[PDB]
Amino acid sequence: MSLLYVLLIIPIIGIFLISTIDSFYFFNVSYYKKIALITTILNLIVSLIIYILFDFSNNQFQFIQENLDLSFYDIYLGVDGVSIYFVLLTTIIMPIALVSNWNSITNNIKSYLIIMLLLETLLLAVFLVLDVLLFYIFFESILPPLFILIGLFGSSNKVRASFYIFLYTLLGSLFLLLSILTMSSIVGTTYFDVLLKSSFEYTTQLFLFFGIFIAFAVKTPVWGLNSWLLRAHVESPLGGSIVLAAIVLKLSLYGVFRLILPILPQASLNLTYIVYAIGAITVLYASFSTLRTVDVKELIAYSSVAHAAIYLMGVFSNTIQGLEGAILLGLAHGFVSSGLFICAGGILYDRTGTRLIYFFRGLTQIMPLFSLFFFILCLGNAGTPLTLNFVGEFMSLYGTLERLPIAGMLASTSIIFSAAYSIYMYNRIAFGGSVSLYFIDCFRDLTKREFFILFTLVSFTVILGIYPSFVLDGLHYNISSVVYGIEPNASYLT
Amino acid sequence: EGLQKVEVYERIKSLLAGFDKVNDPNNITETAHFANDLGLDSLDTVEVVMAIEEEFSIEIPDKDADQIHSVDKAIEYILRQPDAH
Amino acid sequence: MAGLQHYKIAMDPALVRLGSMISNRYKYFRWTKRTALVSFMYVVVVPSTIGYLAYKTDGLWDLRAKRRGDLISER
Amino acid sequence: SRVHRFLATGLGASMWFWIFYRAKKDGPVLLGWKHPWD
Amino acid sequence: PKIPYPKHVWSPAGGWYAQPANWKQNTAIFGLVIFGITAMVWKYSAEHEVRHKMPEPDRFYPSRYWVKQIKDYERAQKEKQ
Amino acid sequence: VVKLTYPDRVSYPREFEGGLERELGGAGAVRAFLCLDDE
Amino acid sequence: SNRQAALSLYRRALKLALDWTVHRNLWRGQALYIRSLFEKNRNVTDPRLQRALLKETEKLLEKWKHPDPYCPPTAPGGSKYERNLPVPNLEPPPPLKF
Amino acid sequence: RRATREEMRDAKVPLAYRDSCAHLLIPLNRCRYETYYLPWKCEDERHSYEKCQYLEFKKRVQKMEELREAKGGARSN
Amino acid sequence: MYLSIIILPLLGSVVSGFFGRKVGVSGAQLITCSSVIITTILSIIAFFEVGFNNIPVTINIFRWIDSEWFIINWGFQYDSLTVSMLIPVLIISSLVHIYSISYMSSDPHNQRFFSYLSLFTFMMIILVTANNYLLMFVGWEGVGVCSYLLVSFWFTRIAANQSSISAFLT
Amino acid sequence: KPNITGFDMREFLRHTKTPTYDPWERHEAWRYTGRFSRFNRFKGALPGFGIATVAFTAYCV
Amino acid sequence: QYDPPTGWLWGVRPGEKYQNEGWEGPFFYGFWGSLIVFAIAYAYKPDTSIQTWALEEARRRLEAEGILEDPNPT
Amino acid sequence: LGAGSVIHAVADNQDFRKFGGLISYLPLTYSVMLIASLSLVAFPFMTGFYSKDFILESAYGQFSFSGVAVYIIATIGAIFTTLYSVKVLYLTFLSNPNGPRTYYRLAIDNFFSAQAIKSYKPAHEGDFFLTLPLVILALFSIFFGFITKDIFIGLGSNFFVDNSLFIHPIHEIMIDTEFAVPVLFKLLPFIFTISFSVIALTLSELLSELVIYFKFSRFGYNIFGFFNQRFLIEFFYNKYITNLILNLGGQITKI
Lengths: 494, 85, 75, 38, 81, 39, 98, 77, 170, 61, 74, 255
Ligand SMILES: CCCCCCCCCCCCCCCCCC(=O)OC[C@H](COP(=O)([O-])OCC[N+](C)(C)C)OC(=O)CCCCCCCCCCCCCCCCC
Ligand SMILES: CCCCCCCCCCCCCCCCCC(=O)OC[C@H](COP(=O)(O)OCCN)OC(=O)CCCCCCCCCCCCCCCCC
Ligand SMILES: *P(=O)(O)OCC(C)(C)[C@H](O)C(=O)NCCC(=O)NCCSC(=O)CCCCCCCCCCCCC
What we know:
The structure is cut from a larger assembly and holds twelve protein chains of eleven kinds. Chain C contains two helices and no strands. Chain C is mainly alpha-helical and about 80 residues long. The N and C termini of chain C lie far apart (about 65 Å). Chain H is mainly alpha-helical. Helix content of chain H is about 55%, strand content about 0%. At the E-I interface, helix 1 of E face helix 1, helix 2, strand 1 and helix 4 of I. The structure holds 1,2-diacyl-SN-glycero-3-phosphocholine, 1,2-Distearoyl-sn-glycerophosphoethanolamine and the ligand *P(=O)(O)OCC(C)(C)[C@H](O)C(=O)NCCC(=O)NCCSC(=O)CCCCCCCCCCCCC.
């Protein structure tokens, strides 16, 4: 039983215990929440054990278990540098997501925990599978649990939201499936170790690129294909929102490393000016739009759109710096956007019952712990240094500028507007007068739970912001394998 | 701790002592009215309120200025405003 | 109002009405001269302009280790 | 307060004396009458 | 006067007019914690400072007393004749 | 106004022996005035 | 109407006249002229002219508006306005769980 | 006598001031280092350096006047 | 000494701001002023050590960002210019901490105000002591954030809110 | 072009001067008294001029 | 004059103590706990990054030229 | 910092049009300004003289159109420098009391009868902590400039041979600054400084109405506001830059 298969098995045992413990003890709801939390903790503990044993400079997939009982659809698991940190981010985030809803579900708690635990197994399976069809099977398997999570525990407009996220993702994924099936037909197999060895013809690469890019653009999302995010990420329960923004957005980013950079390098090189136009447009249009967004979670949801454009531009830079920056920005956005949704969807929305920004003012006066963390998360969302958000933005933007300067400059302008919308929101909530006259009751400050799910998130971004080498050390050799090009005097040694 | 009635009356009384349009300094008292006791025109009362506002370093809104038709009313307005210096 | 009891807010009817109008605004969009031009400016022209500049200047320069007597122009 | 007047005059006494001292020495150089070496 | 303020708000910076009765004691403990880190940093900076030029013996260079690079040089340079 | 009324240079540019070519980085860098064109 | 406006508009004339003139001694004689013109038109009683006369002087008031009029620090527009506003509700939050 | 590169470079003379009259500045900069750059201690050395620079400047102004007439009183800047 | 000039204002800002409840108003003023003064004195020595005797001092602690060609380290470098600018920065900061003992005597947020003043000094010192452009830009963004927090110090005032956004965004 | 209100900028320009008679003269007379007279206010404009001049002359012997 | 420090941490009134919801056990000892243990093991982890392997080879290859000095020549 | 004493002195107020007197109420506070003001306007043999009155000379030292033109520009800016220097000094200390009588009410003059212990507020100065930096900064504004002018200017100073700052030999203009510059232009900023002070000092408390005549003309009113509204580089910023983005965000969200 490989460590990687252990990762997928623990959350399934937790589901079993959650749904059977009543036959051994009316069981208290606190029991279910404790089973689910410990389950995610042991999954985090296993992912940390794997990371200690992980080797930073191996071109072999590590911790793979030999199957040799070949079938039509077999599940092979393996990990290298590009997948190791996405696996860690999934295992760190999900316990925080569980605590972020400890008190705010209050109904169908068994269903919420089983759905949350199942989502962990599926999302981890996405980052661990060593086959392109296996990748697709898990990328899509999460829609029905996502569809039912929003509908069971979402806000007032959760019906329109759940439909939007289901149908957008399916429609785009159906175009990715067509591209994937063409690959398996030509090659005979979708296993990574032998599909990357193959060489597709240019026009095949061109049509393979559109099919895959249409799906990755719905999931980034790119601007104009992002209606589903505006609805789903806001109407979802807080735990759903954290998982949706901090893990699910990353699948398309990790999928660019496994599905287009190795097999479609000519198409990627010849179409970067189209990816960059869409990437540049998304940086500006989203930034201007979130400046005028009045729902606090939708403002924070809309920020994810702007940052996802920056690491989408990085992965197509064909440079070592852009690709490392893209993973580091995708990781950084995972912590910071998780904290900002806890601040908005968890702290403000539980106190007031509303998310309109018009009703908030001067919260610093009564809530100095919320404002202290909120400001640090508003700095991190603005790409301020000593946050992992700056190291990722600077490396991602440097690659974008070097690959194509006109897009780099425009994507650079995000340094202004991210700051602009992040600080403007911060002032209309924490500063900007005395406590809002709409509040009749006074508000309490962060509970111990709220303090420690924020302190944990702001610790990860800051420590990684001062020493990003912890992550870059395990990306240097694997990131190198996805670069496409040669130097005049280093190529073809004899 | 702030401004007391005794201090406000002295500043106000010494302010009107320098005004020629006032009939005499001896008619000034607590319940004095600018209109009939000190005999001031509508324009003179506007001058008096501006002098009071400059002396106490406060800005009086037009609606409040209309309310101040008496020396006692002025003393009460100064006491009501915390900002008065 | 929600599942978990919150604090008592002075839920202003005017602000509530404003936040509902925004959430429902998509249902009332219509194609007119104005709405067609704006939607054509943002979606087609400005993106196609950037795509033109990105396409035209892809590979035009390299800054790496450039010296005096050697240009930045690459094409 | 009396020490404030002492400091105000004292600072104004050290000043207006530094100017006169420097004018006595560096005045010819600044005005161009005598070059600095002479 | 002092502006009224809510008594129920806890801020780590202390709040509105916070001064604990034991402020002198706590100000001494924190000073000691502040002192020890600086000593830890000073020991580091003495060890890892790099200089390609050595000060002349007569000049006022108080770092020669506590840095390792100069002390090793001066110790070796004392061997003459 | 200043363009029509501003003083001409009242000193010949200074000349450094050898042009300081070696001290400024050899012939591959910019050197100083050395028996060059009048200005 | 036509009484409150005349008195309030008169006060703004005194303020603006002093706004442009820093020195108070020059503002004193500057004020008797302002007061004098109000005396010259104290006998007008025709409504068709009373409202027309108020329009001219407000237009004239805007004609010579100071780029930044004076305001006391603790007044709207002042430097100390709302510098340390107190917390509005001093009453402790009601017992809830979050 | 004139100071050559072999010791002028060793003396760390500023590059813009490695001129013909830089041999008087090597002792001046040494005096400046010893006296902590106080502007009342190396007066004799400081004035000595201002002599050679001024004389060369006086030599240069004459050359500039000769150049100006050569072009019939034109503009050289 | 060279690295003590770095961390001392930082420590003074951390204790005053994150433990203003523990040391109180006077405890905070004692630490920020003492840490800045001790830091100020050491700079005066550094001016003699570096500027006057011409010893540039190189101090490299650990790598910050390492990707292929980019090796940006938390490295500091003392030369003539950085000790020239450290003199007014420390001297006026010492005089401003001391000056604020009286100006803010009636302010109800003394600990926070003094915490900010020592963080800005730390960010100024980082800006000029860095030996690369990227680490310098940290102090560049550092003083900018400290400038934003000190403009908006009276955050209940709407006009000072607009000022801090102007300071931040411009 | 005279206005309905008899406001003339030339005499408005002319009137700017210390009036011969003023109803507020007595109230606003303390701003030009001995404490704030023309001589007293400019008496201490340069604080240490007198001391420095005396000291400099002593040094110039 | 100064006020005594006040305020309720975690909203706990001075009369009572913070009540536990049950997340504190696993979070402080399982989540953070394992995160310090992992940090300790990371100090003892062998260094397998490509860079340090490459600097060692880059060193020798530079020592074959005059840029660097061989500690053990020949 | 000395200015901060002035705001702390009266009412936490900082408007010029209500400042006056205070020459005797704040003696030390006035004194530090004068040292600072003359250091700022580069009065001869002061700290600012050795720096400010060397940049201008350096500009003429480079004999070119750009160097000469900026001289004229800087000198005009240097001319206008002393006027607000005069305005700060005069309107707060050397002018007639323009504030309320509360600022200027000493216990020596008997005004009140019963509330004599309080209700005076005679615009007192600050404590030790407020004046110790004031005194210390005063010396730096007199002697620090002269003491360090050899480190930073000298003639051939080697204070930056560690390459910290770098000057290319072809770009050196310092030699011409000391010798080639004509004496008239070297002392020209001082002539304007010591002259234009007297016009500003005569335009107030001596004439005091030439300026208001200019103010109430149509030419002066337009100039006064333009300079008071900071060249209008914030009205076009707020409307044609800031609100353009806000409307762009509006159009994208709504359309
Ligand atoms: C980059 C992200 C941040 C990384 C660094 C994280 C902190 C590291 C140490 C920073 C120095 C210590 C700061 C303490 C500030 C005072 C404590 C406090 O928060 O009080 C809350 C105070 C409460 O203080 P109080 O005592 O006055 O509270 C009671 C009175 N009321 C409630 C009315 C205010 O709340 C506020 O008023 C301000 C709200 C925002 C708080 C922001 C504080 C600064 C946070 C760190 C800034 C880091 C800058 C990084 C720059 C990056 C450079 C590239
Ligand atoms: C690695 C490969 C894995 C392949 C799949 C292996 C199995 C994965 C899980 C599939 C479904 C397992 C369901 C586990 C729960 C079953 C036990 C149960 O009865 O739970 C009941 C629970 C609460 O209901 P109850 O407590 O009875 O009523 C109380 C009312 N007060 O009610 C619930 O829990 C219902 C929860 C909501 C429905 C689940 C989330 C949506 C699932 C959509 C199903 C279709 C897609 C299936 C996808 C499988 C994973 C990809
Ligand atoms: P009091 O009992 O005296 O009040 C009697 C009133 C004034 C109410 C009379 O009954 C009266 O005249 N009716 C009010 C309406 C009216 O006709 N008002 C006439 C005077 S106000 C007016 O319109 C003329 C104002 C002239 C002076 C101001 C001109 C504007 C100056 C602007 C610039 C100043 C600074 C540059």
